[PDB]
Scaffold this active site. Sequence first.
Site: not given
Lengths: 91, 279
Positions: A8-12
């Site tokens: 996952v990339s929690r900045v997105g």
Amino acid sequence: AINVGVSVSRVGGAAQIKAMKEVAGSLRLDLSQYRELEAFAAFASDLDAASKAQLDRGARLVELLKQPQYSPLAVEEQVVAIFLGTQGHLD
Amino acid sequence: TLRELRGRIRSAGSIKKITKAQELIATSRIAKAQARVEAARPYAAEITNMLTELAGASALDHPLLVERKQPKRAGVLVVSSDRGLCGAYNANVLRRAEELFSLLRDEGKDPVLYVVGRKALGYFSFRQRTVVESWTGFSERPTYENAREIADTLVNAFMAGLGVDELHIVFTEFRSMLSQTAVARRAAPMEVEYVGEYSFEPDPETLFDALLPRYIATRVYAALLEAAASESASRRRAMKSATDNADDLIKALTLAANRERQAQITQEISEIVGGANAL
């Protein structure tokens, strides 16, 4: 060997260029559902044609994602490399 | 705690042994079943030849060959296994059974149900539809003695036209060890199939009227043999899957138990050393 399910990339997509954001943004969930579809169909004696087509598309996307060591691809090339797959030209 | 994990590891190991054993057993029984299928075939082929050379002479007016003016009620034989662990076998058979029931009720008929196998019997006893009659205890190794009674009952139910206007059979066709599925066939009324290019005692009509029921019986026999082979093959597949699942469970449990071992030792050592550093 990126685990597309747990990663996952929690900045997105905020830090993703618009080209890649449009071309690839569907790929994550499609590959996750392909992985589960494969886990299922591994023991399906027969299954509908749509599942089989999604399965082949997923297998070819997985084969697309991998690349050799010390071979970084510029984004201008990565977007095309992912276009080939997501838009189905590899079918 | 660790004791639970050790016990579950022991249990999973035992289960893994059992499932591998039954997998190899099924691998042998599929060969037994194919042997019986290919031993039964050469009778059905000669019955087919004889029935067609009789049909060429017969009037082709036997009831089983002529459709009813207005059908209302259709008999359906559902074949299922007597033993579990088969995986999807019963599931596939029964989902196709209900799809056929919905086809019939869309056309305008209603199904009267005959069941082979205890599994489908339990399924249709949970879902409230009344089984007319059922047979159990031979789905693993069907002998002609059983197909005889099944064919007799279905043919008598048809010829009574309580009675039925149609006879179907729901079973599984063994295409190859790796691939199989459930299939639906109409057993009556039979269509007559003209294709382009003898003494009969006492007459051809008599022999044909006596022969068609036995053709039904041998056909249902062949269907049951295909069903048994498919059941053994699906048992193989499902037991291999279960063995693999047990292997992965043993792996995860062993990892968790080793982490618990390490944590327990570390906590014990920290307690001892805190006691030492207190003095």
